[PDB]
C-alpha cells in the first residue's frame, strides 16, 4: 500500500 | 472542463510536463461507472462526496471510518475538488479497522464481496475496485485479485511502501491486476515506492490533498495515495468509451507518460498515469 503523512 | 490550482497530482495526470496547476478533464467525469474503495470505510456524509457515496459492506461493528484514509482515498478517486473522476459513484467496503489494520482472510473475502455485489449495481460504464492496501507476499490474496479482476472489475491495487521490490508484497505482485507506484511533485519515484517488473504504472503519491473524516482535508504521502488516482482515471476513460475493465490498465500505460520520472531503477517502468485530454 501507500498510506494512510505530508 | 478545467479545475484551476487544483491538487498537484490532478494536475500532473492532465499535463505531459510537471509543475501546471490546471486540472484539464472532459466533462464526463466519470459519471455512470463506479468504483468500489476497498479500506477503512468513507465518511460517505462528507460534502465533497455531494451524495455519490456509500457504505455497502463492514467486516466490524461499524461501516464507519474512524481511521480517514478510506475517506481519504475515496475523495482521490471520485471527491469533487480532489478527484479525478468527479461524478463517478463509490462505494465502500470496509476491510480494515480504524488503526488500518485488518486479516488477510477479511480482506480476501471483501474482494469475492464486490465481485458478486457488482451485479446488483447499475453501472452502465463498467466498474472498478482501488485497493490502497497490501502486506507480504500470500497466494491466497493474490489469487483473490485474480479472480476479482476477472470477473470484470478494473482492480488497482498499491505498490506498497518499503522502497522494496513489489514481488514480495501482495496483492501488489499479483500480474493480473494493475500495480501502482507512486512519485512526487518534481517528477521523481517517491522515496518510499516500492518498484519492480511486477508494476505497471505510476500515478502521484507524495504529499496529495483529498478529504478526511470529519469533514476536512489533509495531505498525505504514500503509493495508497497514487493508487486512486489510476482507479479514477480508469473509471473515467471507461465512461468515455476508451477502454474496458479488462484493458484499462494496459491502455493507461500504453498512453502515459513515457520516460519522464526520475530515480526508476533498471527493471521497473518509467509510466506516468495521463489522461490525454484534448479540449
Ligand atoms: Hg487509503
Ligand atoms: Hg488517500
Same mark, same amino acid.
Given at each position: 500500500?501507500?498510506?494512510?503523512?505530508? | 472542463?478545467?479545475?484551476?490550482? !487544483?491538487?498537484?497530482?490532478?494536475?500532473?495526470?492532465? *499535463?505531459?510536463?510537471?509543475?501546471?496547476?490546471?486540472?484539464?478533464?472532459?466533462?464526463?467525469?466519470?459519471?455512470?461507472?463506479?468504483?468500489?474503495?476497498?479500506? /477503512?470505510?468513507?465518511?460517505?456524509? +462528507?460534502?465533497?462526496?455531494?451524495?455519490?457515496?456509500?457504505?455497502? =459492506?463492514?467486516?466490524?461493528? *461499524?461501516?464507519?471510518?474512524?481511521?480517514? +484514509?478510506?475517506? +481519504?482515498?475515496?475523495?482521490?478517486?471520485?471527491?469533487?475538488?480532489?478527484?479525478?473522476? =468527479? =461524478? /463517478?459513484?463509490?462505494? %465502500?467496503?470496509?476491510?480494515?479497522?480504524?488503526?488500518?489494520?485488518?486479516?488477510?482472510?477479511?480482506?480476501?473475502?471483501?474482494?469475492?464481496?464486490?465481485?458478486?455485489?457488482? &451485479?446488483?449495481? &447499475?453501472?452502465?460504464? %463498467?466498474?472498478? !475496485? *482501488?485497493?490502497? #492496501?497490501?502486506?507480504?507476499?500470500?497466494?491466497?490474496?493474490?489469487?483473490?485479485?485474480?479472480?476479482?479482476?476477472?470477473?470484470?472489475?478494473?482492480?488497482?491495487?498499491?505498490? %506498497?511502501?518499503?522502497?522494496?521490490?513489489?514481488?514480495?508484497?501482495?496483492?501488489?505482485?499479483?500480474?493480473? $491486476?494493475?500495480?501502482?507506484?507512486?512519485?512526487?511533485?518534481?517528477?521523481?519515484?517517491?522515496?518510499?515506492?516500492?518498484?519492480?517488473?511486477?508494476?505497471?504504472?505510476?500515478?502521484?503519491?507524495? *504529499?496529495?490533498?483529498?478529504?478526511?473524516?470529519?469533514?476536512?482535508?489533509?495531505?498525505?504521502?504514500?503509493?495508497?495515495?497514487?493508487?486512486? +488516482?489510476?482507479?479514477?482515471?480508469?473509471?473515467? #476513460?471507461?465512461? #468515455?468509451? =476508451?477502454?474496458? !475493465?479488462?484493458?484499462?490498465?494496459?491502455?493507461?500505460?500504453?498512453?502515459? &507518460?513515457?520516460?519522464?520520472?526520475?530515480?526508476?531503477?533498471?527493471?521497473? $517502468?518509467?509510466?506516468?498515469?495521463?489522461? &490525454?485530454?484534448?479540449?
Amino acid at each position: 500500500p501507500a498510506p494512510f503523512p505530508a | 472542463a478545467a479545475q484551476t490550482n !487544483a491538487p498537484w497530482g490532478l494536475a500532473r495526470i492532465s *499535463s505531459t510536463s510537471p509543475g501546471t496547476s490546471t486540472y484539464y478533464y472532459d466533462e464526463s467525469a466519470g459519471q455512470g461507472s463506479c468504483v468500489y474503495v476497498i479500506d /477503512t470505510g468513507i465518511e460517505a456524509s +462528507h460534502p465533497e462526496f455531494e451524495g455519490r457515496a456509500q457504505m455497502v =459492506k463492514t467486516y466490524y461493528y *461499524s461501516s464507519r471510518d474512524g481511521n480517514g +484514509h478510506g475517506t +481519504h482515498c475515496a475523495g482521490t478517486v471520485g471527491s469533487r475538488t480532489y478527484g479525478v473522476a =468527479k =461524478k /463517478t459513484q463509490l462505494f %465502500g467496503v470496509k476491510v480494515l479497522d480504524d488503526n488500518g489494520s485488518g486479516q488477510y482472510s477479511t480482506i480476501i473475502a471483501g474482494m469475492d464481496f464486490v465481485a458478486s455485489d457488482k &451485479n446488483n449495481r &447499475n453501472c452502465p460504464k %463498467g466498474v472498478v !475496485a *482501488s485497493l490502497s #492496501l497490501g502486506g507480504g507476499y500470500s497466494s491466497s490474496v493474490n489469487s483473490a485479485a485474480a479472480r476479482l479482476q476477472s470477473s470484470g472489475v478494473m482492480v488497482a491495487v498499491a505498490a %506498497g511502501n518499503n522502497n522494496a521490490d513489489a514481488r514480495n508484497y501482495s496483492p501488489a505482485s499479483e500480474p493480473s $491486476v494493475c500495480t501502482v507506484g507512486a512519485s512526487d511533485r518534481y517528477d521523481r519515484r517517491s522515496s518510499f515506492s516500492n518498484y519492480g517488473s511486477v508494476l505497471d504504472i505510476f500515478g502521484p503519491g507524495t *504529499s496529495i490533498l483529498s478529504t478526511w473524516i470529519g469533514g476536512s482535508t489533509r495531505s498525505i504521502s504514500g503509493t495508497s495515495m497514487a493508487t486512486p +488516482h489510476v482507479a479514477g482515471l480508469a473509471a473515467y #476513460l471507461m465512461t #468515455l468509451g =476508451k477502454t474496458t !475493465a479488462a484493458s484499462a490498465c494496459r491502455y493507461i500505460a500504453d498512453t502515459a &507518460n513515457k520516460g519522464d520520472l526520475s530515480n526508476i531503477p533498471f527493471g521497473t $517502468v518509467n509510466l506516468l498515469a495521463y489522461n &490525454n485530454y484534448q479540449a
